[PDB]
Amino acid sequence: DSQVRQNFHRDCEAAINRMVNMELYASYTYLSMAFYFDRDDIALHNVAKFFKEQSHEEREHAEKLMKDQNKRGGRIVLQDVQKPERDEWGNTLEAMQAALQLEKTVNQALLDLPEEQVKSIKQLGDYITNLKRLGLPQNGMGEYLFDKHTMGE
Amino acid sequence: DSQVRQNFHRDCEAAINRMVNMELYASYTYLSMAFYFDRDDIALHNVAKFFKEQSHEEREHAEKLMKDQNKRGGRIVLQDVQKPERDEWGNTLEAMQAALQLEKTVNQALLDLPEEQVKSIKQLGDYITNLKRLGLPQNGMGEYLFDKHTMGE
Amino acid sequence: DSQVRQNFHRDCEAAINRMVNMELYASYTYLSMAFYFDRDDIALHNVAKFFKEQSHEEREHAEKLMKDQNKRGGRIVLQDVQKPERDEWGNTLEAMQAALQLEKTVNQALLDLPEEQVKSIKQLGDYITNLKRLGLPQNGMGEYLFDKHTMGE
Amino acid sequence: DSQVRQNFHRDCEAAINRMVNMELYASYTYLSMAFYFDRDDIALHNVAKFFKEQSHEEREHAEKLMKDQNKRGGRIVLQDVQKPERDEWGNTLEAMQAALQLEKTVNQALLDLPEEQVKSIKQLGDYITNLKRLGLPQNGMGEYLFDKHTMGE
Amino acid sequence: DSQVRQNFHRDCEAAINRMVNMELYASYTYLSMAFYFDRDDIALHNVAKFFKEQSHEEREHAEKLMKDQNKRGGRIVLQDVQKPERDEWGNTLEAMQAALQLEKTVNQALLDLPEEQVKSIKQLGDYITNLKRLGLPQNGMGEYLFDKHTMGE
Amino acid sequence: DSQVRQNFHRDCEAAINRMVNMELYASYTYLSMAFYFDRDDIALHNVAKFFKEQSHEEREHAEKLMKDQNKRGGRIVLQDVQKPERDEWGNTLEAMQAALQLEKTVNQALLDLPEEQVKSIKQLGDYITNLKRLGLPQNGMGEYLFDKHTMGE
Ligand SMILES: [Ca+2]
Ligand SMILES: [Ca+2]
Ligand SMILES: [Ca+2]
Ligand SMILES: [Ca+2]
Ligand SMILES: [Ca+2]
Ligand SMILES: [Ca+2]
Numbered sequence: 001d002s003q004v005r006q007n008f009h010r011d012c013e014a015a016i017n018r019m020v021n022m023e024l025y026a027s028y029t030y031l032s033m034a035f036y037f038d039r040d041d042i043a044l045h046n047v048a049k050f051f052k053e054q055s056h057e058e059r060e061h062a063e064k065l066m067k068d069q070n071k072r073g074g075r076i077v078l079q080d081v082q083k084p085e086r087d088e089w090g091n092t093l094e095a096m097q098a099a100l101q102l103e104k105t106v107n108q109a110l111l112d113l114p115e116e117q118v119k120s121i122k123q124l125g126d127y128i129t130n131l132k133r134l135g136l137p138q139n140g141m142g143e144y145l146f147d148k149h150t151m152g153e
Numbered sequence: 154d155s156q157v158r159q160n161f162h163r164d165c166e167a168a169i170n171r172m173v174n175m176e177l178y179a180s181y182t183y184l185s186m187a188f189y190f191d192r193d194d195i196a197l198h199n200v201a202k203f204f205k206e207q208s209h210e211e212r213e214h215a216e217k218l219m220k221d222q223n224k225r226g227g228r229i230v231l232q233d234v235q236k237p238e239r240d241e242w243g244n245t246l247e248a249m250q251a252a253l254q255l256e257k258t259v260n261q262a263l264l265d266l267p268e269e270q271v272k273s274i275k276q277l278g279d280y281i282t283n284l285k286r287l288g289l290p291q292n293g294m295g296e297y298l299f300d301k302h303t304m305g306e
Numbered sequence: 307d308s309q310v311r312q313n314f315h316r317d318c319e320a321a322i323n324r325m326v327n328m329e330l331y332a333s334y335t336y337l338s339m340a341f342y343f344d345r346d347d348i349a350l351h352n353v354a355k356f357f358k359e360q361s362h363e364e365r366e367h368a369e370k371l372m373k374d375q376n377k378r379g380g381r382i383v384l385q386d387v388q389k390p391e392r393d394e395w396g397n398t399l400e401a402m403q404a405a406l407q408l409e410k411t412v413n414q415a416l417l418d419l420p421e422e423q424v425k426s427i428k429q430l431g432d433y434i435t436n437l438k439r440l441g442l443p444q445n446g447m448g449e450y451l452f453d454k455h456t457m458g459e
Numbered sequence: 460d461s462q463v464r465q466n467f468h469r470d471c472e473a474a475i476n477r478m479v480n481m482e483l484y485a486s487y488t489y490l491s492m493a494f495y496f497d498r499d500d501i502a503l504h505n506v507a508k509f510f511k512e513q514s515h516e517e518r519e520h521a522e523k524l525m526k527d528q529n530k531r532g533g534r535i536v537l538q539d540v541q542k543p544e545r546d547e548w549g550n551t552l553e554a555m556q557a558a559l560q561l562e563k564t565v566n567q568a569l570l571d572l573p574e575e576q577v578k579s580i581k582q583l584g585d586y587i588t589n590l591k592r593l594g595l596p597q598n599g600m601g602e603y604l605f606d607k608h609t610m611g612e
Numbered sequence: 613d614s615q616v617r618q619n620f621h622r623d624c625e626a627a628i629n630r631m632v633n634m635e636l637y638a639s640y641t642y643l644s645m646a647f648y649f650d651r652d653d654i655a656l657h658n659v660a661k662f663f664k665e666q667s668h669e670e671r672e673h674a675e676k677l678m679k680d681q682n683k684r685g686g687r688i689v690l691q692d693v694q695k696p697e698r699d700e701w702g703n704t705l706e707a708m709q710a711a712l713q714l715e716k717t718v719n720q721a722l723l724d725l726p727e728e729q730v731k732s733i734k735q736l737g738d739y740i741t742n743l744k745r746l747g748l749p750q751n752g753m754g755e756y757l758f759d760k761h762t763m764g765e
Numbered sequence: 766d767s768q769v770r771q772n773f774h775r776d777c778e779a780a781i782n783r784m785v786n787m788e789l790y791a792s793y794t795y796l797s798m799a800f801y802f803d804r805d806d807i808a809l810h811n812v813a814k815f816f817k818e819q820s821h822e823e824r825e826h827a828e829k830l831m832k833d834q835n836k837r838g839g840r841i842v843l844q845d846v847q848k849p850e851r852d853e854w855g856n857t858l859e860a861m862q863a864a865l866q867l868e869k870t871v872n873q874a875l876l877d878l879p880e881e882q883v884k885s886i887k888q889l890g891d892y893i894t895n896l897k898r899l900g901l902p903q904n905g906m907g908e909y910l911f912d913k914h915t916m917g918e
Binding site: 002003004028031032035036038039040041059063066067070073075076077078079080081082083084087 | 461462463487490491494495497498499500518522525526529532534535536537538539540541542543546
């Protein structure tokens with residue numbers, strides 16, 4: 001047993017390892033979404049840019065948990081990072097609804113294990129409300145305008 | 154009777170107290186409107202930002218009247234600030250029409266008791282004309298565009 | 307039910323609404339105290355200036371709780387803001403003792419629901435100790451000196 | 460078939476997808492190495508810092524290939540990223556020998572599909588030569604000195 | 613009973629007083645270690661410099677708890693600060709192992725009563741691992757090199 | 766016997782150790798005084814601030830004597846630091862009279878073993894003369910004014 005380990009249950013150690021894999025999984029799904037909207041096919045580059053730094057944000061959380069695991073004297077055990085659920089993510093509304101479920105699954109896991117997770121979820125809810133207001137799925141002009149006016153900051 | 158009080162009728166003193174409560178009431182209604190448009194549900198953040206500084210503007214008028222009351226030797230008597238008329242304010246058009254009535258009620262009271270009240274009312278009339286041009290209530294794309302192009306300055 | 311709402315009890319939602327009204331109530335009482343010390347009658351302008359930004363501090367807490375309520379997917383329900391307990395607040399000692407009770411009532415509610423509430427309460431206790439040392443209620447020279455040397459920073 | 464696709468074989472498209480997964484695999488293995496040397500247990504923080512930006516460098520290559528795939532009109536197909544070979548990487552020499560094999564496997568794949576891959580491999584060969592000169596595996600003072608003088612820049 | 617005291621158990625008040633004495637005790641032990649390595653006899657001045665600001669860090673924690681005790685309306689009761697366990701602390705490894713036990717005893721007490729205590733303990737574990745790698749107790753060249761390369765920043 | 770020890774009597778070595786403990790004792794008593802005047806109860810924050818840097822000044826003297834002991838080849842032997850005489854220090858006059866006795870006891874010991882000790886003692890005599898002029902113990906307004914005008918620089 002580790003010399004810096006003091007009052008850190010084997011259960012917390014195993015839960016942090018599940019959270020690391022979950023965050024890497026979330027990062028991979030956002031990476032997949034980022035390059036889907038960059039397709040010539042799809043071409044909504046500010047939506048793509050949002051999913052790419054969301055991908056980076058989740059990879060950063062995973063590295064911070066790994067840091068925390070070593071700090072407390074736990075041992076990091078890595079698992080395969082499963083391929084994302086879909087290869088195509090439909091339109092901006094569909095993709096944002098899938099991202100909201102993903103952030104709620106990550107947040108659920110953190111509860112079972114924050115001021116930032118709730119910020120992220122409120123942001124995705126705001127986005128979904130505005131995409132429905134602009135008439136998605138059907139209104140392509142609405143989708144173009146969302147990428148320029150909301151995702152272009 | 155106050156040592157600085159000179160040519161200030163008991164009627165003007167009571168009217169200034171009614172105006173203080175009216176301005177606090179207007180501030181509370183705008184605060185209510187500000188946080189309604191911030192709902193994940195509604196999410197028109199520049200409309201929300203407009204109602205929040207309108208809320209601050211009315212609270213500032215109330216403090217200036219209280220300042221004026223003491224300056225003239227009157228005595229401030231505060232009353233309960235009634236809860237706003239509605240908890241939900243509908244859409245941007247509905248909310249702007251309710252704000253125009255509120256500014257006209259405040260302005261009516263000031264007449265019975267300015268270069269700024271008329272500016273505020275002309276501004277709300279301009280806003281309502283443009284929301285009707287954009288097709289509110291029905292046109293959600295119009296409402297999104299109003300929040301970006303007019304309320305985003 | 308709200309799309310961003312995840313693990314937020316109906317009880318926490320109702321308690322946050324009670325806290326919003328309590329903070330607006332505290333803000334109104336401090337506003338009342340601020341303009342009492344500004345009377346020609348009373349004229350302790352640094353005591354007045356302290357109660358006015360205390361009034362602003364409590365209104366800011368109420369807006370932050372409203373922000374938090376929307377973030378979590380709760381719905382803000384506003385109530386009347388009751389008129390302050392008194393129209394006259396006596397002398398600086400009397401007013402500071404009333405402010406200490408008010409901050410303890412707000413802090414009690416937050417317990418039932420901080421690093422800042424305890425700071426505020428220790429500050430009011432310090433003030434009351436020094437007003438008793440200067441001989442309040444009777445010693446008017448003490449009261450004048452407190453407004454200049456402690457409340458003038 | 461894609462409107463921007465011109466003279467891009469289905470074979471090149473499938474090979475770029477294998478290379479993306481290989482680069483993500485290399486990134487994950489370096490991440491694993493980075494946090495192994497950060498253990499209280501191991502504690503060679505400049506060796507850890509080297510493997511962490513190597514992890515970032517490989518993730519950047521994978522994103523650039525994905526960019527290239529969309530540019531040419533190919534379609535990105537992601538696969539699971541397999542867990543690294545080991546959970547423990549032994550000492551600095553063992554870890555550097557494992558990194559040299561990994562960079563040679565990546566470089567082999569790129570041949571089958573550069574001025575930077577050969578730079579990286581010559582760098583790892585230089586490191587291994589110096590670790591053998593310092594007496595690794597046995598000489599712990601040598602290993603400490605390598606982390607300070609070579610990996611500390 | 614104190615006028616600012618609200619929801620602060622007599623048990624928390626007595627525990628904070630035990631923690632103040634414990635932190636002063638830790639400060640005194642580090643002071644003792646600091647001047648041991650400054651002996652002409654021993655002369656590892658960067659190890660000495662580390663223990664002197666560790667001594668200052670623990671004295672600062674004790675003053676912050678005393679601040680917290682008055683803030684909450686508790687009353688500070690001081691006790692004798694016991695002389696450190698040893699007058700001689702052996703070599704750098706022996707001293708670092710004694711410091712790790714001391715930080716774990718302080719951290720245990722804080723549990724019974726943080727993001728900084730775990731940082732401090734991981735740092736001492738890292739140091740001990742590197743001193744064992746350099747061949748302490750026997751290898752004096754290793755000890756000299758540790759003082760220059762790790763403790764010299 | 767130490768290799769740098771030349772013409773340093775075993776008597777001077779033992780006296781320097783008594784002086785180190787005496788200075789740590791003086792530091793602890795001033796620390797106790799510093800946090801007494803910070804009580805909500807007492808609240809004379811510039812008197813508190815004076816005793817806190819006096820506490821730091823005595824701890825600095827103790828560290829300088831320890832430095833001198835090693836320089837000359839003596840060996841530092843630490844003793845328990847006794848708890849201060851009182852837990853409550855009364856009023857500012859009482860506390861200043863206790864500080865004057867403490868500085869005279871430290872200065873007596875230094876004689877038996879300066880341009881700074883006499884400065885410190887003349888300063889405390891000046892303070893006591895002015896507190897008696899302001900009517901301490903009875904005159905609380907005098908005590909408040911001393912904290913603002915003399916201790917506020
Ligand atoms: Ca799979
Ligand atoms: Ca009502
Ligand atoms: Ca009422
Ligand atoms: Ca596998
Ligand atoms: Ca003892
Ligand atoms: Ca004793």
